[PDB]
Design a protein around this nucleic acid. Structure first.
Length: 290
DNA sequence: GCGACACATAAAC
DNA sequence: AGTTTATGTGTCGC
């Protein structure tokens, strides 16, 4: 009934079929590593502004809630939360150096203001985009919102156990414990060490995330989970790393910029999951029917 | 099949 | 040690 795999950090992922077994909502058995991500492609090259060195980039994503591996399929539930986390790394540049440097897109050179991640859901068979929604912990007693673009600096991805532990922390002392893992506070650096043109100082806010954490995520309530043939639709979750540039023929999305104008999120790299099945609200998707 | 409201139960403190 | 929080899911009414 429960199939167990050891995660990288020694925690377990415990896969079970909610059609057959009901587990408590706050059980640690609801936390588990989801499907592994794969490269879709690399897009615009990025170079350091004096050396000309190409910046090596890699997205490091993981799903930590919401998906079970059940007989060779990855299965989620429309009504339930998933968690998708991601960082990125720069193989050839340590963070401290990276933040003092400046970088251009090779298209002919657009200056990078900052790096950021976004996520999307798609129908994996036809590339149609599917809406995602997020809640706060208050769920129906708080607002609903669509996942946002997350400015980020390079960082290792926290272990599954760390994401689990930090999921519902309010206590101030405990929050302090995790702060350095999730945030860089630009207002606490020595400003005299940095040039006006430095990458750190073109980030839009002082509080800069080191990890993009999309928690309490669902597919939009209106998604059809089956095809007309009654076969399951196949979905995929995508993570896109971009460079945000000032707007004034390569893939990009428009972005609501800080100063009011509309800039460009220029694609750098994209990863996606294998095909995903989503179980809808039908009673037959739950053990209560049996 | 979906929005709303309800109940239940382990985590968080 | 008890209370509140957070979240899977049961149920009602259209």
């Amino acid at each position: 009934v429960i199939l167990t795999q050891l995660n990288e950090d020694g925690t377990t992922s415990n896969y079970f079929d909610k059609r057959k077994l009901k587990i408590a909502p706050r059980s640690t058995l609801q936390f588990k590593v989801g499907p592994p991500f794969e490269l879709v492609r690399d897009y615009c090259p990025v170079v350091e502004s004096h050396t000309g060195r190409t910046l090596d980039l890699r997205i490091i994503p993981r799903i930590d809630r919401g998906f079970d591996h059940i007989d060779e399929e990855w299965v989620g539930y429309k009504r339930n939360y998933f968690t998708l986390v991601s960082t990125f790394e720069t193989a050839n540049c340590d963070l401290d150096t990276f933040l003092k440097s400046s970088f251009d897109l090779l298209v002919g050179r657009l200056r990078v203001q900052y790096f950021a991640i976004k996520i999307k859901a798609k129908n994996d068979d036809d590339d149609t985009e599917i809406n995602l929604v997020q809640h706060t912990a208050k769920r129906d007693k708080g607002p609903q919102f669509c996942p946002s673009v997350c400015p980020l600096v390079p960082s290792p991805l926290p272990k599954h156990q760390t994401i689990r532990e930090a999921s519902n922390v309010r206590n101030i002392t405990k929050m302090k414990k995790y702060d350095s893992t999730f945030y860089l506070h630009r207002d606490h650096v020595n400003y005299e060490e940095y040039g006006v043109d430095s990458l750190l100082f073109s980030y839009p806010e002082d509080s800069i995330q080191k990890v993009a954490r999309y928690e309490r995520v669902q597919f939009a309530s209106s998604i059809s989970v089956k095809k007309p043939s009654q076969q399951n639709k196949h979905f995929s979750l995508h993570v896109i790393l971009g460079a945000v540039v000032d707007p004034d023929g390569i893939p990009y999305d428009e972005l609501a910029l800080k100063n009011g104008s509309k800039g460009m999120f220029v694609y750098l790299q994209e990863m996606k999951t294998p095909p995903l099945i989503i179980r809808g609200r039908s009673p037959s998707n739950y053990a209560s029917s049996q």
